[PDB]
Structure 1
């Protein structure tokens, strides 16, 4: 079926010409590939390092098997540098195969705060990029299902004005057919005692409080990975070709005109064993936030201070690979009474004050006085190039916290036999980088440094949000079900104060795998790599269309935005194509 359609021999595409080459068959790459080939006259070649996985079995198709895929050939498992905070190497989970990280992710489907997307036009000078336009694309991608009586009784609320029901990505409530645990409504009641809202639709634009949420799965509970949703219904199109098992190494550039033009790519598996293919219109990079910047650097598009010591000639100088923003995740886990049994997920989207509690005043004071110093320190660490322009970002985050009161941390609850919180600070001020370390793309030798916890507010906020997760687990209605803590358990005294949490947290955290910003969409003079149509500055016919481009984090899970962002970009590509006919 679809398996027989995939190309595997490099020689069957080498030296030919297509209209668009898409590097990476993941979330954004497959969305754009489908939109472009709706026109039967447009040819698209997707080149993907992995292969088809959607039909493999529960390890892909059951969202409840989350994490068992880690460490396998479907996980790139990119390795960080030796992190300064704890002198350890960390692993970055990332899907390897058609659908990308939508093959391996938690399936959570929520949207950020309206003011966060709006800042993309007001602060980051991106025409047409605002909550209304992005949300309209989001709803157009969405095919959501309202919850039933069982699901509403568990704790779901669904405002139909905030969801599309006619789109492409199937979404609805996760339901294992088991009973839902009462612990979800117990956590809601526990935060209502503190004046915290509950059951806001996290798709409507003000994610705050404790709520349940849809999941990216079909009603029969099969995972809605981007390949199942966007490629499987369309693979029979003769103008849509997919080459699997090959890495895109570099963009081929014209030597001709005033400014360079992308004319194709080189792809392969090892030095001396690579091939060319030509793009008549454009090359679109969709290899993920950890990779698309490295493809640019291997092609001579990046920072001369990085490329010259490797013997790569710089043809376009841009701050490629900087401004990397990922979050830190920690765990609090507790056994539950027999009364707590049942399925169910929920999350507390907590504000700054809700996160810091007693430390709210001191934290606000740091935020009010340290921005300039913090920016100088991040630039000195190589996380950004221009202190003045980084400060624009920090002033924007302070307005989000102080004037808009957006969610600052996320406390994610799993039940199904226990009470377990994964906790992350949503708005890190640290900035990191990814840079190549060799001229050979197929060696994949690079330095990936998110600089976790090298901003003191990031460490304070993470410690405070995790302490809060212990607090709320044994508070209010949650006391009914509390049966003793197992994480941290013995490793951190149960009455630890914030200082004790700060000492513990660097040795008990994982990456959140939400990395954005390595080809930031903002003006060049602000440190950006792409314009408001995702075009790389100073190069014709070349775009970065994936998680590399969001200039900020957001108080949500990213799929709702990335699906919208891919469709918005597809409209721009098609508009430029049309103007030539």
Structure 2
């Protein structure tokens, strides 16, 4: 009904992080008809705009509410795996931290055309930075807005920095400057515009909505790609979910389908489309267009655990929870005024924007990311704590003052999978994060050494001044066996998820796309999202996805060549 009569040069499956970038670059010259299909609604929510309202986004209608399969190795628990469900996708629901990782992360891809020297300028072109001048590592002209966080906890942020220096860490003035080592302590920059969320909807798609050769459908769930025995013809979708009519939209001669449904839903949709392992497709009676081993394999996420400590009685009131909520759980008028008049104060904060990269054991690159939060976790699951913080509003209770240190295996060795639980394309995918399954127990050792590290930092003179005991893991958790048991019971996502449609050199039977992002053995089918990342970079994965979408858009419009 909506694309009746219509042929498109490009159908983008999903309207997420990468899709918003592609929709912008691909529609620019006005020749090409571009369609964007997004399952979630328009990006209008105030909870999306205000960084601190990330607390309200978890387990909300603007999240996919995905749960993993039972993880035997994680005390037989299902892991919640947050994913944005709206225009902008996960860029609209994330912690806004701006990380590229290290030169070494891209060199390690071993994929011709995509070394550190090849990707750097695509990061720089996307960027306008408020706090770093233009040069080799920072741009001043790009659509992304990156700034230093506009909230500082004078007492606790300074205490954390002094504590890190006391335990022998060096400051890192810029975690995205590849001229110096990744390791050290400091401040993470944020994808904000004076304390407003600068998601890829706001920065790339919203400004070009008026273009006549660009059509964006929201509430548009793609059930499958249409492929012909092979060549993409287009895609099928519903605009009323499962009980809705099954509309179809068609390509123009030489017109491509571009998978931008992310590292969870891209592998899922390919499998529903006959692209994936024959074994798995055969199981639900799905015809096999291209037998690809890699589809849904090599799922990389950075797992997390945390320590948390209350402050002494004399420091009650200095935590970010005290800057946002009064003693009765009502949002402080001071916080609201500072935000709306100045783009300042606790509402500009996603909480976790100071920390460190640490080598726990002389690795080439840091294995441990620390995220310091000047607020106290009341659940050992950091994501659960954020949900509970949102539900805490107007309960007539005071959130206790304290700190949290979240410990992240940021270059993990463990891998997981996405597959099918049924043939119903509206049923949740079969999601297994595979945390702590690497054969050497390297990821478990990272997090265990991380807890030891967080305890040393808390015991430092700088932080001992402020702190009064330890809540999590607590007194009782002393031995490595007890720490390991705590980690298994409490381990949560730091919300990355890459690698499920991995790119490779010619003659790599594990890769799903070439160094030009084309699905192996299909014509007019590309993947441009986090799925293509072969080896996860150290740090949060939003910036690298935009670099890939920027490069992909240049490839497609003939502005650049790869290899």
When the two structures are superposed, what TM-score results if normalisation uses the length of structure 2? 0.83
Does 1:166 find its partner at 2:136?
Answer: no
Q: Render the CA deviation track for 1:327-354: whole Å, top value 9, x for unaligned.
A: 2111111222455936674111011327
User: 2:367 & 2:26 partners in 1: Cα distance?
Assistant: 37
Which structure 1 residue ranges, 4+ long, deviate > 6 Å from structure 2? none
User: 1:78 & 1:72 partners in 2: Cα distance?
Assistant: 11
Deviates more, 1:201-210 or 1:160-169: 160-169
Q: Judge conservation of contact 1:14–1:275 (CA < 8 Å) in 2.
A: no
User: 2:67 & 2:7 partners in 1: Cα distance?
Assistant: 35
How far off is 1:109 after superposition?
0.8
Q: Match for residue 371 of structure 2?
A: 412
Q: Render the CA deviation track for 1:85-134: whole Å, top value 9, x for unaligned.
A: 111112110000000011111111122111111222xx3xx222122321
How far off is 1:449 after superposition?
0.7
Deviates more, 1:160-169 or 1:337-346: 337-346
Q: Match for residue 137 of structure 1?
A: 122
Q: Render the CA deviation track for 1:464-517: whole Å, top value 9, x for unaligned.
A: 21232122122131222223322223xx526x1323201221111212221111
Q: Judge conservation of contact 1:20–1:283 (CA < 8 Å) in 2.
A: yes
Question: Aligned pair in 2 of structure 1 residues 577, 248: CA closer, same or farther (>3 Å)?
Answer: farther
Q: Match for residue 61 of structure 2?
A: 73
Does 1:346 find its partner at 2:346?
Answer: no
Aligned residues: 492
User: 2:63 & 2:548 partners in 1: Cα distance?
Assistant: 24
User: 2:23 & 2:372 partners in 1: Cα distance?
Assistant: 35
How far off is 1:68 after superposition?
1.4
Select 1:84's aligned residue among 48, 63, 72: 72
Q: Match for residue 432 of structure 2?
A: 449
SS of equivalent to 2:225: strand
Question: Aligned pair in 2 of structure 1 residues 253, 576: CA closer, same or farther (>3 Å)?
Answer: farther
User: 2:11 & 2:134 partners in 1: Cα distance?
Assistant: 39
Q: Match for residue 468 of structure 2?
A: 483
SS of equivalent to 1:162: coil
Select 1:52's aligned residue among 18, 26, 42: 42
SS of equivalent to 1:326: coil
User: 2:6 & 2:131 partners in 1: Cα distance?
Assistant: 47
User: 1:537 & 1:271 partners in 2: Cα distance?
Assistant: 33
Structure 1: 5+ residue stretches without partners:
1-10, 148-157, 355-400
User: 1:194 & 1:475 partners in 2: Cα distance?
Assistant: 7
Does 1:16 find its partner at 2:16?
Answer: no
Q: CA RMSD in A?
A: 2.1
Does 1:551 find its partner at 2:528?
Answer: no
Does 1:284 find its partner at 2:247?
Answer: no
Q: Match for residue 361 of structure 1?
A: none
Q: Match for residue 522 of structure 1?
A: 504
Q: Match for residue 150 of structure 1?
A: none
SS of equivalent to 1:19: strand
Q: Judge conservation of contact 2:134–2:140 (CA < 8 Å) in 1.
A: no
Q: Judge conservation of contact 2:263–2:498 (CA < 8 Å) in 1.
A: yes
Q: Judge conservation of contact 1:200–1:207 (CA < 8 Å) in 2.
A: no
Q: Judge conservation of contact 2:319–2:403 (CA < 8 Å) in 1.
A: no
Q: Match for residue 97 of structure 1?
A: 86
Q: Render the CA deviation track for 1:46-103: whole Å, top value 9, x for unaligned.
A: 00001112x321x211112222111111000112111111111121100000000111
Q: Render the CA deviation track for 1:238-257: whole Å, top value 9, x for unaligned.
A: 111101101111111123xx
Does 1:427 find its partner at 2:386?
Answer: no
How far off is 1:301 after superposition?
0.8
Does 1:267 find its partner at 2:237?
Answer: yes
Q: Render the CA deviation track for 1:140-178: whole Å, top value 9, x for unaligned.
A: 11111017xxxxxxxxxx8965211211011112214xx
